[PDB]
């Protein structure tokens, strides 16, 4: 171990969550998970985009519209009736918009 | 100034205490602890492999 500090695995201190680019969930090695052309990029959950060809870059920051929609729906159930700011009681330390710094 | 340099933008973000959540729901909403299609994987269901 030879280390002392904020250990994320049991301290809830996750500073590396911004390094992800995309996630591809595939059931039975043949079925992509969301399927049904659910997302703007149905094949995988694109977290960050670099080339940003046509239009998929949500907010003034990086990160894609589909991932923003997924995060908003998972944390607050927002992305369908607009993108209003969630109420204060729903916004906690471990939440998404409380720590999303563009 | 007019003596500026022609340049390019760079965008990014930081999330310092977030667990990236992908809910196991048909519409990604949270309308119950027992999610929508998680209950739909019990119809005498078979075994699946996840990658």
């Amino acid at each position: 171990f030879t280390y002392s500090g904020t250990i994320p695995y049991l301290d809830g201190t996750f500073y590396l969550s911004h390094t992800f680019r995309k996630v591809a969930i595939q059931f039975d090695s043949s079925v992509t998970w969301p399927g049904n052309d659910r997302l703007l990029t149905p094949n995988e959950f694109e977290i960050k985009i670099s080339v940003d060809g046509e239009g998929y870059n949500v907010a003034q920051s990086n990160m894609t519209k589909d991932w923003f929609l997924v995060q908003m729906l998972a944390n607050y159930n927002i992305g369908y009736q607009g993108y209003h700011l969630p109420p204060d009681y729903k916004d906690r330390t471990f939440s998404f918009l409380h720590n999303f710094i563009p | 100034d007019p003596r500026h340099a022609l340049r390019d933008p760079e965008r990014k973000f930081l999330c310092d205490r977030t667990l990236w959540r992908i809910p196991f729901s048909s519409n990604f909403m949270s309308m119950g602890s027992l999610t929508d299609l998680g209950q739909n994987l019990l119809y005498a269901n078979a075994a699946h492999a996840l990658d």
Binding site: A74, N75, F94 | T18, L19, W20, R21, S30, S33
Partner: peptide, 30 residues
């Protein structure tokens, strides 16, 4: 008894809570 003897009496009527108030559900991984 009525279990009203175990609750504070705001005058005469007891300060009973909701019938469905019992139980809790607080569970999310993130």
């Amino acid at each position: 008894y009525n279990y009203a003897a175990l609750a504070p009496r705001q005058g005469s009527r007891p300060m009973l809570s909701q019938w469905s108030g019992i139980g809790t559900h607080e569970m999310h991984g993130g």
